[PDB]
């Protein structure tokens, strides 16, 4: 990746950039589909604040195959614990499958965080448990 | 690769 050492750059405010750098990277690195992506948006009686996220397709193994979920999801410095905004993102041709896992906007439902918060549960730790539940149930199913 | 997301009914 190129991009890295940029988006290193591109936070520098972070509560912990190196930890979170990091993280970012290793998730990525393990799954190879998600890429960290920028944003920023007024919050402190308005003003920008410079937010990453992370963006990309998932793999989503089935019954006997192997898709691409897309997701995004926000993250956060470091309070309380983890990130807590996600959300799916799906295509015009995509179909989004209510669930507890969904309400219809691609927002994820559950505690998650407020459940566990062990934490034992890390970064990567984190999508890991949304692509082993949506590794069965599919969240959204697009057409053929 | 693209999205598209895993088949159902």
């Given at each position: 990746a190129v991009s890295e050492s940029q988006l290193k750059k591109?936070?520098?405010?972070?509560?912990?950039?190196?930890?979170?750098?990091?993280?970012?990277?290793?998730?990525?690195?393990?799954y190879k589909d998600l890429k960290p992506v920028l944003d920023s948006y007024v919050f402190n009686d308005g003003s920008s604040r410079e937010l990453m996220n992370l963006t990309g397709t998932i793999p989503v193994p089935y019954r006997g195959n192997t898709y691409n979920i897309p997701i995004c999801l926000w993250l956060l410095d470091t309070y309380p614990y983890n990130?807590?905004?996600?959300?799916?993102?799906?295509?015009?041709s995509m179909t989004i499958k209510?669930?507890?896992?969904?309400?219809?906007?691609?927002?994820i439902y559950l505690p998650y965080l407020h459940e566990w918060k062990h934490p034992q549960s890390d970064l990567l730790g984190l999508i890991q448990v949304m692509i082993v539940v949506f590794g069965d149930e599919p969240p959204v199913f697009s057409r053929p | 690769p693209e999205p598209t997301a895993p088949p159902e009914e």
């Open positions: 591109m936070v520098s405010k972070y509560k912990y950039r190196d930890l979170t750098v990091r993280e970012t990277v290793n998730v990525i690195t393990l990130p807590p905004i996600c959300f799916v993102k799906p295509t015009s209510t669930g507890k896992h969904v309400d219809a906007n691609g927002k | -």
